[PDB]
Amino acid sequence: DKIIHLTDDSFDTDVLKADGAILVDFWAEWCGPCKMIAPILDEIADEYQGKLTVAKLNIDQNPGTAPKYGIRGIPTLLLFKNGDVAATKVGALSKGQLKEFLDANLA
Template sequence: MMSKALELTDETFEEEVLNADADTPVLVDFWAEWCGPCRMVGPVVEELAEEFEGKAKVGKVDVDSNSETSTKYGIRSIPALLIFKDGEVVDQIVGAVPKAQLKKQLEAQVTN
């Protein structure tokens, strides 16, 4: 299955997330291969990427290979999901949370 969520790196983060269209919220999933809860959140993030196509951008940052971005945003525990809008963090969710909660928080940014 083709991944809908963008694979973000230290190199592409600024362009894809911080310079995204001001009206487009960006959900970023900070995760790692070895993190159990991250593997639970991963499929949910993919579903949201599909559901919000055209309304929001969804991406993933592997904290092991992109420590610069993870450090910049103070990611200490994963999974951590940050919602950016106009280059700023407008919401954050730490830990494995139900899809409905993630969806609600992302939807709140889409309509604003």
């Protein structure tokens, strides 16, 4: 619904050319922690509408994008502000932990 579903072709447009903040989630289907945080990312899209947009890129279906941001470990949450990484979070975390990360880097 409110979450952008990225591909390798849509990443520049959806992410790098966006006028505002976008939380990108680099994930895969076999990754248990990625699946842990997925419903938390749905809640965050709701609570932070007007402040931020959530986007997801699946690194198996789209294998070109991840090695440009040096990703070696999933889930990796990267926060962008007009196309530049502001903040990096590696591994699973809770709703409250993710909020705290957002509130402090939304800045």
